[PDB]
Design a protein around this ligand. Structure first.
Ligand code: HEM
Ligand SMILES: CC(C)(C)OC(=O)N[C@H](CS[C@H](Cc1ccccc1)C(=O)NCCc1cccnc1)Cc1ccccc1
Ligand SMILES: NC(=O)CC[C@H](N)C(=O)O
Length: 450
């Protein structure tokens, strides 16, 4: 029973139950459990997901040591989850030097400059987003934002990943919309992670085996046709590391879809919940959007980077709702960091959500206050506490793309509409008690036309 480990190391934490460990304690969610451990235990604690020891760490130096200083040597991979099948080749899932290769091959895809070329295609769908919003706006009926934002998120994806171009909300069941639609179990992994190789030998998959088979073929539909977008950029690359294979490109595409789809849509919904429940911040943003882009002029790459308040609204939103919730690295070797022994196989965990709401680093942390990210105040913000995109060599590769995409949505939408709360709006919003950082009730708000 692996449940003596922290107890030996002199590291504190909750007593595990046989077999389940501390998972019973997840009934309020990952987040509330992390906060309560933090406030009960201080700078470090340990717990067991089943038999898996997990060590939480909250010292910023120690966090930097783990995420950055000792990344390639010790804290290189994430907690293995499965069964993944061919998606083991996905970059977010791959390990050790197999990953170091993929990161290299896929990096220039995400540069400052390549993102600059991607904006005019993201624009044409900002319009779509607005005319989609208008036909819901002139019909005075509260709007579920995950739906209209989700549709925009997806529109960006298929063009930026494959050059495909659809009006998904309206324009129909396109041969591409319904596969990507397959966009309770994942807990019972952890009492039984010895069953992963069982499923992995039953060829089952957490990526529905028909979606992938479609993209696997739909991507190999797009390849031999050409012979602007991620596919392009990846394909152009395979012309020091071995070039990207053919099933590898598919799995990365899948990861880009998974990554971008329910992230862009959900943050955008959080931002509009906050903007609507704070009518004044919406006002200041709408002023900035008009002083920079007068006469509803179309946003650009450089004018997006110019909007400082827009950036403050985005950053603070992700402080309250960091959708990763936690960052995790597998300790791959017996190791000591900043005066603490961490033994092999331990999963080291950084409770991002809990650290973003710590009253010790943040005043009024449950309040939404975009002035903490002002040039005046922004300096006092430890980048190893605020880590909505991770840090170090393994942080979110799509960071600059995520931000640009979202801001482009916001600017366009805020140029035509203000957003009020509605009687069905959940005030105060509540996080889905499950494993995902989404709201319980979906965000429904009033939309008006300026
Ligand atoms: C609001 C949007 C997003 C947020 C807040 C976000 C945040 C994060 C975080 C916290 C991580 C883990 C970082 C770490 O472990 O240190 C991550 C990983 C990752 N993200 Fe994002 N992400 C977003 C969107 C995207 C998008 C649009 C892409 C598009 C390609 C993307 C691609 C990835 C990949 C590939 C990884 C894993 C990278 C690796 O393991 O090398 N993400 N993201
Ligand atoms: C089951 C659990 C929670 C233990 O394991 C994870 O589900 N976890 C990620 C592995 S599957 C995920 C894609 C996916 C596949 C099937 C169903 C849902 C999701 C993935 O790899 N997404 C990386 C792309 C991304 C997502 C979010 C933000 N940015 C980029 C690994 C991971 C965890 C946190 C942040 C980044 C990666
Ligand atoms: N380049 C590296 O990351 C590792 C260096 C070492 N020579 C090796 O081949 O593993």
């Amino acid at each position: 029973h692996s449940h003596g480990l922290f107890k030996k190391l002199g590291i504190p934490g909750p007593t595990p139950l046989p077999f389940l460990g501390n998972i019973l304690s997840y009934h309020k969610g990952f987040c509330m459990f992390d906060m309560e451990c933090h406030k009960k235990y201080g700078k470090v604690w340990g717990f067991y997901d089943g038999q898996q020891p997990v060590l939480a760490i909250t010292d910023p130096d120690m966090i930097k040591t783990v995420l950055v200083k000792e990344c390639y040597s010790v804290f290189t991979n994430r907690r293995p989850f499965g069964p993944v099948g061919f998606m083991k080749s996905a970059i977010s899932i791959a390990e050790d030097e197999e990953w170091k290769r993929l990161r290299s091959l896929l990096s220039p895809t995400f540069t400052s400059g390549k993102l600059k070329e991607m904006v005019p295609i993201i624009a044409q769908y900002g319009d779509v987003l607005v005319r989609n919003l208008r036909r819901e706006a002139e019909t005075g009926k509260p709007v579920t934002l995950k739906d209209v934002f989700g549709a925009y998120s997806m529109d960006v994806i298929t063009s930026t990943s494959f050059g495909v171009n659809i009006d998904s909300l309206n324009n129909p069941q396109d041969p591409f919309v319904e596969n990507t639609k397959k966009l309770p179990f994942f807990l019972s992994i952890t009492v039984f992670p010895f069953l992963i190789p069982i499923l992995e030998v039953l060829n089952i998959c957490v990526f529905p085996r028909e979606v992938t088979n479609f993209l696997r073929k739909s991507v190999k539909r797009m390849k031999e046709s050409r012979l602007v977008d991620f596919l392009q950029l990846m394909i152009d690359s395979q012309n020091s590391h071995k070039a990207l294979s053919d099933l590898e490109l598919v799995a990365q595409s899948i990861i880009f879809i998974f990554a971008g789809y329910e992230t862009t849509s959900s943050v955008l919904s959080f931002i509009m919940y906050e903007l609507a429940t704070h009518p004044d911040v919406q006002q200041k943003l709408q002023e900035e959007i008009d002083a920079v882009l007068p006469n509803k002029a179309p946003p650009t790459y450089d004018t997006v980077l110019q909007m400082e308040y827009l950036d403050m609204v985005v950053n603070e939103t992700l402080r309250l709702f960091p959708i990763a919730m936690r960052l995790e690295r597998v300790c791959k070797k017996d190791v000591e960091i900043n005066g603490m022994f961490i033994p092999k196989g331990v999963v080291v965990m950084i409770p991002s959500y809990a650290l973003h709401r710590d009253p010790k680093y943040w005043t009024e942390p449950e309040k939404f206050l975009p002035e903490r990210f002002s040039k005046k105040n922004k300096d006092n913000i430890d980048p190893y506490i605020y880590t909505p995109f991770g840090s170090g060599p393994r942080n979110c590769i799509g960071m600059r793309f995520a931000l640009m995409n979202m801001k482009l949505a916001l600017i366009r939408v805020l140029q035509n509409f203000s957003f009020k709360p509605c009687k069905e709006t959940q005030i105060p919003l509540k996080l889905s008690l499950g494993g995902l950082l989404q709201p319980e009730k979906p965000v429904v708000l009033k939309v008006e036309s300026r």
